[PDB]
Amino acid sequence: PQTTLHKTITPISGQDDKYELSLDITSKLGTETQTDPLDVVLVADLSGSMQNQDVQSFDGRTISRIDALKNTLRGTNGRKGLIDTILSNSNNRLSMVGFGGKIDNKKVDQYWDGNKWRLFRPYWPYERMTKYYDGVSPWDDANTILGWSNNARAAKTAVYNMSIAGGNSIGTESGIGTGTNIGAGLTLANQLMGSARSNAKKVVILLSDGFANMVYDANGYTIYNYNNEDPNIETAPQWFWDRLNNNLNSLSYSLAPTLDGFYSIKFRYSNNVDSITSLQYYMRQHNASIPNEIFSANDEDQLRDSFKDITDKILPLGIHHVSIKDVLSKYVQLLPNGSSEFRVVKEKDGSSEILTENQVTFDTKTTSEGLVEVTAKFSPNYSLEDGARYVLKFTVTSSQEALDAIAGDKKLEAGDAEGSDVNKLYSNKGASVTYSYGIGNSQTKTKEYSDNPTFKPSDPLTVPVEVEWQGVTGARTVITADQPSNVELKLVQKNKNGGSDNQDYRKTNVNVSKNVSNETRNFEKVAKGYQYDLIAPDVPAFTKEIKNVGTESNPSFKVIYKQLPSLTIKKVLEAENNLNKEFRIKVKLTSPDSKPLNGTFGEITVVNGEAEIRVEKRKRWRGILSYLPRGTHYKVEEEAASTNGYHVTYENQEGDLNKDETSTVTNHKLPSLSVTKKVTGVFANLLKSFKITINIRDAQNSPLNGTYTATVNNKRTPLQFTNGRASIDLNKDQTIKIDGLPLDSHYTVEEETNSSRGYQVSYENQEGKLDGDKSATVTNNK
């Protein structure tokens, strides 16, 4: 009648992105019924078999079936009995009826000729010939125990007065008989129901204990089935079956379209012949919409419960056939593996209990739009206690759509959120309750929830990024190289759905100040739910290393720049005179992977791991192979040509470049001997070749051997010394500078005797030690 609908979404505190939806409903009537008076007719088997003492009572005694139902209706000392139940409401009135058949028909006639009686005229298998008895009453196999009455006391007395017929039952005998003529009871019920209030709820409750062994004829005389003379053999001839089905059908045709409900209880049903089944069929044929059920009871307790069930279906607590439904918006989803804890809670006067599986079921359809429909279907018959709170509770989490939205990666459209605020996302697309009030699926109203709740997703992430600049040897060594002025960094978001990764998702630029080695900056509003990586510039002179120092779910990136090492070649000039000299130094460079190197590095270019440095005064006698790969192996050697005149020693000539190295080529100019020929007594001449022998012993006292560079007339020439003797030809006023002679060697100059042809030969510095540049002169006088 009256219903209260409320729905909210409550944040589960200290669980990120988890909420609880609560959809409650509360029933309210006010009084007893919404002025829907009941007209209830009880039809009771009063057959002989219904006095069978074979029923276990609540108190542990076996009593008779009559005795049992005498208690189930009236009530064991004001115990809640069917009578009381129904007539609790003063608008409600009830009629009671008892049925039991008498044998109006004969089996087989015999002939008593004042002597003997043997079978004369058979009737039992009627080929349309049965004869009955005389004076038998038609329509006499049932009586109204109680006409329409709202007087519970009178009814309790009437039940108390219910009793089974006495003697073997012939149609002559008055009152009901001891047979089962179910047709009889229903006939009378139909009559009573015709006098029922035609704006009440007409309900009939049938009760039987065995199969119907009797059928009324068209005239109302009772035909008994003599095939069932043995109670242990329920067997019937064809024509009897026909009449029974027809009678049942006819009764149903008149009753069912007037009834609002029909209920049958087969107490202690024994006969394999099942005819309450047949009744249900015909009833449904003539009214498929009415509640139509058959119960099975074997003891007094089972009878009470089954009776009560009917008094709970016609006489309501409240509302039934209940179903609570929520369609979730795109912005929420259910926890996997039924972790949402779908539960319906009942509020009993403050206190509360969880409805069981037998009270409520849960369903998960995916809807036509493409959203999820949570459906809380209650047991069809479950009635909501008047003024109790039945609340559906379950957990949901933010969808990716929501997580995207709060980061600002998805656009709120129309009615996705309250006032297009991402902190006010709507959790439901729509939600509803369906219920019925009355008997069966009659009223079936659907109210849509008025409330549209809102929630805020978890704060998007702040993904931090640090940039460390390290010098050659590591952190806290000064950087000597040009840094850029800043580096632009870009957060990359790996695409879940396919291949197209977002390489410009967010962006930040980090200032690079010299003399500050650590600087952090942040990417703000990053969406939860994704893996992320970092793009960072390749800075010249440095190596890069990007690493996520955090988690996947909470990234934090660091980028380390470490300056590459470089090799410097210095040349030192011992015996320095000329400053405007150049020297070439070779450097073989084998990179890590033990593979040769290729690239350019300062002003020095590297091919297959070779490189050549030309050093001179204006270059500060230095050359630098800058920012070579870490751990590059190097090996130095001065070029052959440049080792002329000089003894060349070396420092750091080979190693690995893990720090900045300096290799140093020192050069010691070696002594030189110069010999000059001067002539006296002549002026200019062709006869001028004078042959002059030089003897040199090393410092080791050892005769010199091999070739040395001698310049004559600005023309480098090889001079061969053999056993410390060489010879030269000099012209008037010519010199020869023999270069590269060993330090501390000793020399002698003399003139070949044939070349001294009538010449006074004089000498200056004729012998000497070569501790530096020495010079000799030979003079001639003709």
Residues between 74 and 133 that touch Mg ion (CB under 5 A): none
Task: Work out how close the CB of 240 gets to Ca ion at its nearest, in angstroms, rounded to a whole number.
Answer: 17
Closest listed residue to residue 373, CA positions, set 424, 447, 430: 430
Residues between 123 and 142 that touch Ca ion (CB under 5 A): 140
Between CA 252 and CA 337 the distance in angstroms is 51
Asked if 178 touches Mg ion (CB under 5 A), the answer is no
- The Cα-based distances of 13 to 17, 343, 479, 708 in angstroms read 10, 19, 50, 96
Closest listed residue to residue 148, CA positions, set 88, 87, 208, 98: 87
Do residues 37 and 202 make contact, with C-beta atoms less than 8 angstroms apart?
Answer: no
Q: Where are the beta strands (DSSP E) in 329-440?
A: 332-334, 343-348, 351-354, 363-366, 372-377, 389-398, 425-426, 428-436
Q: Which of 26, 27, 47, 169 binds Mg ion (CB under 5 A)?
A: 47
Give the range of 46-54, 191-199, 292-300, 344-352 binding Mg ion by CB under 5 A.
Answer: 46-54
Q: Which does 140 bind (CB under 5 to 8 A by kind): Ca ion, Mg ion, none?
A: Ca ion
Closest to Ca ion by CB, 102 vs 320, is: 102
Do residues 760 and 742 make contact, with C-beta atoms less than 8 angstroms apart?
Answer: no
Q: Which does 180 bind (CB under 5 to 8 A by kind): Ca ion, Mg ion, none?
A: Mg ion
Give the range of 47-55, 415-423, 504-512, 706-714 binding Mg ion by CB under 5 A.
Answer: 47-55
Between CA 330 and CA 414 the distance in angstroms is 13
Residues between 202 and 221 that touch Mg ion (CB under 5 A): 209-210
Q: Which does 47 bind (CB under 5 to 8 A by kind): Mg ion, Ca ion, none?
A: Mg ion
Residues between 46 and 105 that touch Ca ion (CB under 5 A): 102, 104
Q: Which does 190 bind (CB under 5 to 8 A by kind): Ca ion, Mg ion, none?
A: none
Closest listed residue to residue 589, CA positions, set 568, 609, 605: 609
Closest to Mg ion by CB, 99 vs 542, is: 99
Task: Work out how close the CB of 186 gets to Mg ion at its nearest, in angstroms, rounded to a whole number.
Answer: 15
Q: Which does 739 bind (CB under 5 to 8 A by kind): Ca ion, Mg ion, none?
A: none
* 227: Cβ contacts below 8 Å, ≥ 6 apart: 124, 233, 235, 236, 237, 240
Give the range of 173-181, 329-337, 376-384, 499-507 binding Mg ion by CB under 5 A.
Answer: 173-181
Between CA 139 and CA 182 the distance in angstroms is 12
- What binding mask, one character per residue, do residues 167-206 give for Ca ion by CB under 5 A, x or -? ----x-----------------------------------
Q: Which does 222 bind (CB under 5 to 8 A by kind): Ca ion, Mg ion, none?
A: Ca ion
Q: Is 279 helix (H, G, I), strand (E, B) or coil?
A: helix
Per-residue 3-state assignment (H helix, E strand, C coil) for 90-107: CCCEEEEEEECECECCCC
Give the range of 170-178, 180-188, 269-277, 710-718 binding Mg ion by CB under 5 A.
Answer: 180-188
Q: Which of 17, 36, 38, 49 binds Mg ion (CB under 5 A)?
A: 49
Closest to Ca ion by CB, 137 vs 590, is: 137
Residues between 547 and 566 that touch Ca ion (CB under 5 A): none
Partner residues linked to 465 by β-bridges: 521, 557
Give the range of 4-12, 32-40, 127-135, 175-183 binding Mg ion by CB under 5 A.
Answer: 175-183
Q: What is the DSSP string of 731-762?
A: -TTEEEEEE-PPTTEEEEEEE-GGG-TT-EEE
- What is the C-alpha R_g of the chain? 62
Q: Which does 104 bind (CB under 5 to 8 A by kind): Mg ion, Ca ion, none?
A: Ca ion
Asked if 222 touches Ca ion (CB under 5 A), the answer is yes
* 629-641 residues labelled b (16+ CB within 10 A) or e (exposed): bbebbbebebeee
Residues between 134 and 153 that touch Mg ion (CB under 5 A): none
Asked if 470 touches Mg ion (CB under 5 A), the answer is no
- The Cα-based distances of 194 to 205, 255, 680, 703 in angstroms read 16, 9, 177, 158
Q: Which does 404 bind (CB under 5 to 8 A by kind): Mg ion, Ca ion, none?
A: none
Strand 292-297 relative to strand 261-267: parallel, antiparallel, unpaired?
Answer: parallel
Size of the site for Mg ion (CB under 5 A): 6
Task: Work out how close the CB of 180 gets to Ca ion at its nearest, in angstroms, rounded to a whole number.
Answer: 14
Q: Which does 210 bind (CB under 5 to 8 A by kind): Mg ion, Ca ion, none?
A: Mg ion
Closest to Ca ion by CB, 140 vs 661, is: 140
Cα angle: 413, vertex 414, 420; to 5 degrees: 75
* 143-174 residues labelled b (16+ CB within 10 A) or e (exposed): bbbbeeeeebeebbebbeebebbeeebbbebe
Binding site for Ca ion (CB under 5 A): 102, 104, 140, 171, 222
Binding site for Mg ion (CB under 5 A): 45, 47, 49, 180, 209-210
